[PDB]
Design an enzyme around this catalytic site. Structure first.
Site, PDB file in Angstrom:
ATOM      1  N   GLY A  46     -53.162 -59.233 -23.064  1.00 61.03           N
ATOM      2  CA  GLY A  46     -53.358 -60.365 -23.957  1.00 61.03           C
ATOM      3  C   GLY A  46     -53.855 -61.611 -23.217  1.00 61.03           C
ATOM      4  O   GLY A  46     -54.576 -62.422 -23.796  1.00 61.03           O
ATOM      5  N   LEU A 117     -42.695 -52.122 -14.199  1.00 60.84           N
ATOM      6  CA  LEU A 117     -42.514 -50.751 -13.736  1.00 60.84           C
ATOM      7  C   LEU A 117     -43.805 -49.921 -13.796  1.00 60.84           C
ATOM      8  O   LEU A 117     -43.889 -48.895 -13.133  1.00 60.84           O
ATOM      9  CB  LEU A 117     -41.363 -50.090 -14.492  1.00 60.84           C
ATOM     10  CG  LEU A 117     -39.955 -50.481 -14.034  1.00 60.84           C
ATOM     11  CD1 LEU A 117     -38.959 -49.569 -14.725  1.00 60.84           C
ATOM     12  CD2 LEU A 117     -39.777 -50.425 -12.521  1.00 60.84           C
ATOM     13  N   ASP A 156     -42.546 -52.844 -28.301  1.00 56.38           N
ATOM     14  CA  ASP A 156     -42.469 -51.554 -27.628  1.00 56.38           C
ATOM     15  C   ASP A 156     -41.591 -51.644 -26.380  1.00 56.38           C
ATOM     16  O   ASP A 156     -41.354 -52.711 -25.812  1.00 56.38           O
ATOM     17  CB  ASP A 156     -43.844 -51.015 -27.259  1.00 56.38           C
ATOM     18  CG  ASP A 156     -44.493 -50.065 -28.255  1.00 56.38           C
ATOM     19  OD1 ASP A 156     -43.758 -49.509 -29.107  1.00 56.38           O
ATOM     20  OD2 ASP A 156     -45.735 -49.886 -28.170  1.00 56.38           O
TER      21      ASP A 156
END
Ligand SMILES: *[C@H]1CC(=O)[C@@H](O)[C@@H](O)C/C=C/c2cc(OC)cc(O)c2C(=O)O[C@@H](C)C1
Length: 305
Positions: A46, A117, A156
């Site tokens: 984004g 991660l 998410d």
């Protein structure tokens, strides 16, 4: 020995939350002018994200910039919506504040020195089971918090949303948007046709991803496992085909069972947070004394002192 004693919020956790609060308060007003760029963290998506020093405070922060034009008082509204990130959870990334400047939204977060991660995965290749146990615990608790407070849709749980640091903390960054996907989808089967049941799916998919070192739909099938150890087409695959699984032999039966329970297609059958919290993977994981910081610092080449 057999002590097994901390608390609901291990006083350390509680203390770190207080310390952060105080520091957030002594920063004061957030002006573009007070930020010296140190580096460009994981950029793009984004918007680019920068590591920055805030000269007044002497604090290192992560500042995310999204480009969005218009600034007519109702911006101090768009900013107020972002001010809802002003979360008090050890499993949620700290928020300093948000402002507008030069046709650019700024959202300033706590600097997590291990990064996301997805980026650790690239350095690691694969993330080992004991680490993913601790990750699993942090994520589950983070959802529990969000479900029992913010009632927030989240969005998410992916590797990109899980940030880590050299103190061994693991926090979600996924923060909502009201803002007026290249091969990979983390959408539950049901939502390809809200609630935590969708997030349990994503976490399950993400654990497979991080465990094997590869987004796992479609399955490696063509050996790869032997070696290792479009969107529209993919969606029908997620709906029609069976869920992914860990390979056998390489991962504990507890671990395989846990992810299997996260990735049941029908959300009525799929596990809820409460069951995950008391699954044997989690129970074992919670008792293991894992040197997550040392694993993490070595993996990404972070100097600890
Ligand atoms: C929260 C994470 C995101 O929105 C997603 O773009 C993320 O994967 C990009 C990385 C952000 C990041 C990276 C590092 O690396 C050292 C450290 C921090 O603190 C952050 C971070 O918190 O950025 C926030 C603004 C976005």
């Amino acid at each position: 020995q057999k002590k097994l004693e901390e608390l609901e919020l291990d006083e350390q956790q509680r203390k770190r939350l207080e310390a952060f609060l105080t520091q957030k308060q002594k920063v004061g007003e957030l002006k573009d002018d007070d930020f010296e760029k140190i580096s460009e963290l994981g950029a793009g998506n984004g918007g680019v994200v920068f590591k920055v020093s805030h000269k007044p405070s002497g604090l290192v922060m992560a500042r995310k910039l999204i480009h969005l034009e218009i600034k007519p008082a109702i911006r101090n509204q768009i900013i107020r919506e972002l001010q809802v990130l002003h979360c008090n959870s050890p499993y949620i990334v700290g928020f300093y504040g948000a402002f507008y400047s030069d046709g650019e939204i700024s959202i300033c977060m706590e600097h997590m020195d291990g990064g996301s991660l997805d980026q650790v995965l690239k350095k690691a290749g694969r993330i080992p089971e004991q680490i993913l146990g601790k990750v699993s615990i942090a994520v589950i608790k983070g959802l529990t918090y969000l479900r029992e407070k913010h009632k927030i849709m989240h969005r998410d749980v992916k590797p990109s949303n899980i940030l880590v640091n050299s103190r061994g903390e693991i926090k979600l960054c996924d923060f909502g948007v009201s803002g007026q996907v290249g091969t990979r989808s983390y959408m539950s089967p049901e939502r390809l046709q809200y609630s935590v049941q969708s997030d349990i799916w994503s976490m399950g998919l993400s654990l497979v991803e991080m465990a094997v070192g590869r987004y796992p739909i479609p399955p490696p099938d063509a050996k790869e496992l032997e070696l290792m150890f479009a969107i529209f087409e993919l969606l029908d695959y997620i709906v029609n085909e069976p869920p992914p699984k860990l390979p056998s032999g390489v991962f504990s039966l507890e671990f395989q069972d846990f992810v299997n329970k996260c990735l049941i297609k029908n959300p009525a059958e799929r596990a809820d947070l409460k069951q995950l919290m008391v699954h044997a993977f989690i129970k074992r994981s919670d008792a293991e004394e894992v040197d997550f910081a040392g694993w993490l610092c070595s993996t990404i080449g972070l100097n600890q002192p």
